[PDB]
Amino acid sequence: SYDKVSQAKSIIIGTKQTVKALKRGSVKEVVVAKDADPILTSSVVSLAEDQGISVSMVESMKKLGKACGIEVGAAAVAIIL
RNA sequence: GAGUAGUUCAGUGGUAGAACACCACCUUGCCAAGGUGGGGGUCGCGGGUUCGAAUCCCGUCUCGGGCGAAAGCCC
RNA sequence: GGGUGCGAUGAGAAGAAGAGUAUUAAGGAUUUACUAUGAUUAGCGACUCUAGGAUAGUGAAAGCUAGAGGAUAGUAACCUUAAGAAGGCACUUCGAGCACCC
Numbered sequence: 001s002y003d004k005v006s007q008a009k010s011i012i013i014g015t016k017q018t019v020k021a022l023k024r025g026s027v028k029e030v031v032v033a034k035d036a037d038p039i040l041t042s043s044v045v046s047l048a049e050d051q052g053i054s055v056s057m058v059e060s061m062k063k064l065g066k067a068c069g070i071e072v073g074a075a076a077v078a079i080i081l
Numbered sequence: 082g083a084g085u086a087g088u089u090c091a092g093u094g095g096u097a098g099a100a101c102a103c104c105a106c107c108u109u110g111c112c113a114a115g116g117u118g119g120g121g122g123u124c125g126c127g128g129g130u131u132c133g134a135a136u137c138c139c140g141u142c143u144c145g146g147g148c149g150a151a152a153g154c155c156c
Numbered sequence: 157g158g159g160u161g162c163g164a165u166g167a168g169a170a171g172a173a174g175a176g177u178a179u180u181a182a183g184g185a186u187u188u189a190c191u192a193u194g195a196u197u198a199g200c201g202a203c204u205c206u207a208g209g210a211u212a213g214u215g216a217a218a219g220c221u222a223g224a225g226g227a228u229a230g231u232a233a234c235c236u237u238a239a240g241a242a243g244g245c246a247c248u249u250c251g252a253g254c255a256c257c258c
Contacts, residue, residue, distance in 0.1 A: 014164035017251070037165060065164070070252080074164050 001056065005031050006067040010080045013068045015040050018078040022047045028081035029054055033061035036075035044076050 005011065008029075012021050021027050022044070030048045032041050034057050048055045058064055065073035 014166070014251070016164075016166075018164095020249095040165070061164090068164090070164070072163050072167095072252085076164085 001031070002058065002063060002067040004029065005064065005077060005079065008079045008081060011068060012078050012080050013065065013070055013074050015044055015074075015076045018076045019044050019047060021078050021080055022051060022053075025051060025053075026080050027053060027078045029056070029079040030076070031056045031058060031064065031078065032076045033058050033064050033074070035059060036061045040075050 012018055012027075018027075018030070022030075030044070030053055032045060032048075032055065034041075045055050060073075061075050062073035064075075064077060065071070068074055068077050
């Protein structure tokens, strides 16, 4: 949901920073794009599903980053609430 | 008059030069640079003159160009 | 404020390598090669020998080709000492603008 990402209080942008955020489990929701490379997505959805956190899948990664406030797009973004 | 190496130019009778690129090793992270080493050329082509022709002579082709009614000529 | 190129398929900062390497020296060492030079005088042109070649003049010996052999320095290669760097991808965190043009 692009709506939940555009809103929310505490978010984090980028795959590396989202997995690093998963390494402390201070994240409430995880939003990942489907059109992104699976080599980069599987790595985060594995740990996400392992932690027991909810895993969402969205269409485009461009509109994702657009919803995050960034101006280039993001492969994976986590709401750290 | 122009024509020579991949290319840009030189070379005005003593066997073909420079850079830039291609290649090797330095240098296995991948490069790039760099430092060395190396390779490559019917001088447009065939004659001719000469010990010898990228040079000069004649023929020939292309192209630029200029004179011309043209065929042709000049650089 | 205007215009493009790129960026969570990771901008840009930093570190880490890179590396005590490439290199400048101060030497040491005296072979490999690399290139440079062969008195005068003929002579445009000459390290020496071999083999061919091919040769007009000058010449004791000539310009092509292939080997082989000599001393002079200058190199780069093994050491030692003192100095001795660096850009990009990729690593490693921070994580968003960097670059060129009026």
